């Protein structure tokens with residue numbers, strides 16, 4: 001997250017931190033995710049497509065720090081890693097950048113809600129907030145594009161939804177953004193998602209509760225002028241999601 005603020009998991013209790021185990025036994029951070037029901041975390045396919053073996057992934061819930069324990073955190077293995085059959089990666093964009101991780105503890109259980117762990121509501125199909133609406137993004141991703149390290153503490157910021165009309169201008173993303181994506185940016189281009197925030201939540205109030213409107217997918221640079229964050233439009237994927245969560 002570029003700009004924004006440090007936060008704790010209690011302000012974004014649906015946030016999931018996804019890591020990969022490596023042959024030496026080194027474990028490194030992969031991507032964010034969001035808990036949409038006790039047994040299911042939603043994220044982005046591009047995070048996993050290069051190594052799609054479920055047995056190498058670890059999901060944390062209730063976690064406020066990247067490389068140390070938070071009280072009340074829960075660790076899960078991945079019982080099913082479901083990557084979108086039509087995923088593809090273009091030159092800039094990813095398409096159908098959406099993945100589901102069925103989580104199960106080594107003790108055989110799904111997530112139990114707490115002060116630090118809650119599910120996030122899904123939107124109604126094809127229901128999105130109006131453009132100009134302020135939404136929240138969260139993650140352990142880079143604080144600058146050029147950074148080598150990820151921050152140790154979870155971050156959050158606020159961005160505003162941009163119209164497709166605006167996002168599709170040639171000096172924004174032109175042809176590369178589609179209707180299955182959503183753009184969001186800071187009006188002054190000061191704050192943004194970045195590398196390492198992929199798969200994490202874009203949350204907006206829709207009706208009267210916080211709702212998962214987007215999944216961090218891609219952008220050119222981070223917090224660069226005329227280059228918004230691009231997000232998977234969750235409201236376009238409910239049948240896909242329901243097909244696996246049923």
Ligand SMILES: N=C(N)NC(=O)c1nc(-c2ccco2)c(N2CCCCCC2)nc1N
Nearest residue numbers: 145193194195198217218219221222223229
């Ligand atoms: N909102 C944005 N402006 N940007 C991002 O969301 C974003 N940005 C980057 C990135 C980092 C540096 C330049 O671009 C990035 N990367 C970089 C390596 C290849 C792609 C996947 C991971 N992933 C993202 N999701």
